[PDB]
Amino acid sequence: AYLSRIQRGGHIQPFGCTLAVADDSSFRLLAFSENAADLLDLSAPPPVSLGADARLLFSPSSAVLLERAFAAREISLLNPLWIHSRVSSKPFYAILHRIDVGVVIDLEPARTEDPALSIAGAVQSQKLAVRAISRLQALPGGDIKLLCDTVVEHVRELTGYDRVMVYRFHEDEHGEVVAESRRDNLEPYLGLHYPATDIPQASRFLFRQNRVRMIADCHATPVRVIQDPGMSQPLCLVGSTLRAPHGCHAQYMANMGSIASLVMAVIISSAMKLWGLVVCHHTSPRCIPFPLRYACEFLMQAFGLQLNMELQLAH
Ligand SMILES: *[C@H](C)[C@H]1/C(=C/c2[nH]c(/C=C3N=C(/C=C4\NC(=O)C(C=C)=C4C)C(C)=C\3CCC(=O)O)c(CCC(=O)O)c2C)NC(=O)[C@@H]1C
């Protein structure tokens, strides 16, 4: 059951919306989350319709960015786009990736400043991460616990999550919280052990390709994807920033009091291995912007390399 449900579960989180777009320069809509028109401020077919031109959802200037982005040799290099809904001029980060049927566009509301205040957030993010990487590189060697303690302190500073932990997989695949930074009125999870089966093999496997996963609100009602009747299976959402969590895990989050989460792979060699996760929790809803998630992502690559070095060294 799990892998196909996670890969093609037909649902996204309601803080954003998702389009699937033809990859042939027509920009025809192949699919859209049912909330797309509402989130785009779009109350003779409606602009959010199967086969309609996705470019006509956005300002004319936005459309020109989508064309370059789709035409580029490597789509991820322009992520995220800064674009505007046609009618309302509502701004979004657009994150684009390719799948079997076309291009998936994840649309995350940006919180409206001027573009220079917008640039300052993104700038400070990328530099906050290089700073955290160099603070890790400044650490004396042969001390993994100190490396882990430092990562959680920086990640908490960056993200503002109530709780940030390093979760290490033991050989038998059960996990242990081996480092923790949290606001001091929260019960610590540091030193707690959790069964292997809390994180199915499918979830652990997917973290190799999908290194960063954010859930805004475990209680939010997952949003259905409307798709072309010609598509023979549910849209591949495995790479979506907005993919809705499996119902079991949504309930696990609510039982744990983690209303919001940010979870990130710790990758090493062995032959690349998932050694652990950096797990972030919030006791209320939270969805930090993409550029800050991108920052953590390259911090976690950096963390992974230093960690692997310190390992393959006892080895
Ligand atoms: C449901 C019957 C079973 C189940 C399924 C399940 N679990 C996940 C994913 C995760 N589980 C996590 C567990 C923890 N989070 C913590 O903070 C701690 C401990 C302090 C644990 C042990 C984590 C992390 C994940 C990753 C989630 C993420 O944010 O990506 C999934 C996959 C959900 C998805 O949609 O990707 C599933 C199906 N969990 C259970 O407890 C029961 C047995």
Curated annotation (Swiss-Prot):
Contains one covalently linked phytochromobilin chromophore. The gene is PHYB. GO terms for molecular function: phosphorelay sensor kinase activity; photoreceptor activity; protein homodimerization activity. The keyword Transcription applies. Belongs to the phytochrome family. The chain holds residues 114 to 453 of 1178 of the full protein. The keyword Transcription regulation applies. Keywords: Chromophore, Photoreceptor protein, Phytochrome signaling pathway, Receptor, Repeat, Sensory transduction, Transcription, Transcription regulation. It comes from the Eukaryota. GO terms for cellular component: nucleus. This is Phytochrome B. GO terms for biological process: detection of visible light; protein-phytochromobilin linkage; red, far-red light phototransduction; regulation of DNA-templated transcription. The lineage of its organism: Eukaryota, Viridiplantae, Streptophyta, Embryophyta, Tracheophyta. Regulatory photoreceptor which exists in two forms that are reversibly interconvertible by light: the Pr form that absorbs maximally in the red region of the spectrum and the Pfr form that absorbs maximally in the far-red region. Photoconversion of Pr to Pfr induces an array of morphogenic responses, whereas reconversion of Pfr to Pr cancels the induction of those responses. Pfr controls the expression of a number of nuclear genes including those encoding the small subunit of ribulose-bisphosphate carboxylase, chlorophyll A/B binding protein, protochlorophyllide reductase, rRNA, etc. Residues 143-311 form the GAF domain. Homodimer. Phytochromobilin binds at C248.
